[PDB]
């Protein structure tokens, strides 16, 4: 299934997360993106920050050139990093992303975070309305088929939606979302504005020691998810993915393992009951896996 975006384009509701920590050799991003496309992934989420756009792009181009898929079948996302928020830097950043991936366009270009950074942690002060205007210019130039934001709260989304002269609403807001942090309020707000919430860390994050508290609860060990996995003869990961699909959320899933990449495409093979849905709804504990002790003082910190 795909969801119709508010600009008329369609987004597959299951996306493949490509990010890996820098101690992961860059070859792996190439090999696994190919496996993801062979497994049935069409939505691919990359970013300038990930230092993998060349490898992810080459996997997409490899699968096109061998007849597996056509460019039209692939929904490719890149993101504008926070050091490029100043409006004159936005298009060059997208163009640079296009050359690394060797693609003519991205299906979706996002503002990675509202927390602007020094162009070149050093904060910067940018009016994100001007950043969005340059976002809109890229869509009008054909370099991005759709544009959106990421890690925005409700107030930051309102800043864009109430912008005078606004030409394109953001098609999506990609935010951390999982049973332990389910974003029900923001989902309802985005739903009311025809903005698709896209969930990252839907499986509980990669728990990287540099940003995730070691003592934070492991999402996939959660007793309710494992009991539901046993009930439906699925895995705890699949229950968490299916939860987002049935609440109208487009869900990303990162795996660099061949068997788990294929497992995640079985999210379409079963359904949760309404009672199952409410049990997962009760697991929220406002848990941000991405601890931001260095960023909580940013004027645009989205969790304040
Ligand atoms: N806009 C933003 O600020 C932002 C922030 C974070 C992430 N993202 C993007 O969205 C993706 C979000 O995912 P994430 O990086 O936070 O990790 P994730 O999708 O929440 O998954 C976490 C871990 O689950 C494991 N996994 C995948 N399938 C599994 C399965 N059936 N069973 C058990 N474990 C499974 C993976 O380990 P294995 O690799 O070993 O399988 C993965 O490291 C990212 O890759 C990135 O593209 C965006
Ligand atoms: C806050 N982070 C860590 C980080 C890691 C991965 C992703 C992603 O996967 O998008 C986003 C942010 C930094 O500033 C570096």
Give the helix/strand layout.
Elements: E1 2-4, E2 10-12, E3 14-17, H1 26-39, E4 43-45, H2 53-65, E5 75-80, H3 87-101, E6 106-111, H4 128-140, E7 144-150, H5 154-161, E8 172-176, H6 184-192, E9 196-200, H7 223-232, H8 236-246, E10 250-254, H9 258-264, H10 274-281
Parallel strand pairs: 3-4, 3-10, 4-5, 5-6, 6-7, 7-8, 8-9, 9-10
Antiparallel strand pairs: 1-2
The chain binds NADP nicotinamide-adenine-dinucleotide phosphate and the ligand CN(Cc1ccc(C(=O)O)cc1)C(=O)C1=Cc2ccc(F)cc2OC1.
Binding site for NADP(+): 18-19, 45, 150-151, 174, 200-206, 254-256, 260-264
Main location: cytoplasm
Site (Important for substrate specificity): 49
Description:
NADP(+) binds at residues 18-19, 45, 150-151, 174, 200-206, 254-256, 260-264. One of its GO terms (cellular component) is cytoplasm. Keywords: Cytoplasm, Lipid metabolism, NAD, NADP, Oxidoreductase. By secondary structure, the protein is of the alpha/beta class. The chain has one domain (1-304). It contains ten helices and ten strands. It has helices at 26-39, 53-65, 87-101, 128-140, 154-161, 184-192, 223-232, 236-246, 258-264, 274-281, and strands at 2-4, 10-12, 14-17, 43-45, 75-80, 106-111, 144-150, 172-176, 196-200, 250-254. The strands form two sheets. Strands 3-4-5-6-7-8-9-10 form an eight-stranded parallel β-barrel, surrounded by four helices. A two-stranded antiparallel sheet has the order 1-2. α2 crosses α3 (87-101). The radius of gyration is 18 Å and the shape is globular. The structure holds NADP nicotinamide-adenine-dinucleotide phosphate and the ligand CN(Cc1ccc(C(=O)O)cc1)C(=O)C1=Cc2ccc(F)cc2OC1.
């Amino acid at each position: 299934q795909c969801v119709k975006l508010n600009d008329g384009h369609f987004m597959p509701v299951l996306g493949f997360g490509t990010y890996a920590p820098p101690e992961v050799p860059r070859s792996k991003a190439l090999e696994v993106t190919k496996l993801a496309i062979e497994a049935g992934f069409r939505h691919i989420d990359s970013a300038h920050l990930y230092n993998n756009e060349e490898q992810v792009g080459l996997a997409i181009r490899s699968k096109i050139a061998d007849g597996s898929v056509k460019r039209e079948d692939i929904f490719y996302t890149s993101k504008l990093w926070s050091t490029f928020h100043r409006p004159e830097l936005v298009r060059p950043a997208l163009e640079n992303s296009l050359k690394k991936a060797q693609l003519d366009y991205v299906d979706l270009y996002l503002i990675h975070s509202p927390m602007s950074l020094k162009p070149g942690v050093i904060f910067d002060i940018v009016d994100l309305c001007t950043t969005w205007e340059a976002m809109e210019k890229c869509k009008d130039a054909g370099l991005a088929k759709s544009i959106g934001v990421s890690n925005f709260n409700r107030r930051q989304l309102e800043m864009i939606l109430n912008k005078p002269g606004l030409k394109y609403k953001p098609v999506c807001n990609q935010v951390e979302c999982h049973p332990y942090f389910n974003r029900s309020k923001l989902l309802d707000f985005c739903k009311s504005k025809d903005i698709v919430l896209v969930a990252y860390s839907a499986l509980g994050s990669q728990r990287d020691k540099r940003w995730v508290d070691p003592n934070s609860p492991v999402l996939l060990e959660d007793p309710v998810l494992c009991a539901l996995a046993k009930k439906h003869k699925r895995t705890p990961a699949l229950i968490a993915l299916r939860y987002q699909l049935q609440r109208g959320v487009v869900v990303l899933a990162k795996s660099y393992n061949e068997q788990r990449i294929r497992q995640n495409v079985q999210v379409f093979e079963f359904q949760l009951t309404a009672e199952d849905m409410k049990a997962i709804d009760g697991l929220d504990r406002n848990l941000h896996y991405f601890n931001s002790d260095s960023f909580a003082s940013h004027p645009n910190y989205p969790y304040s």
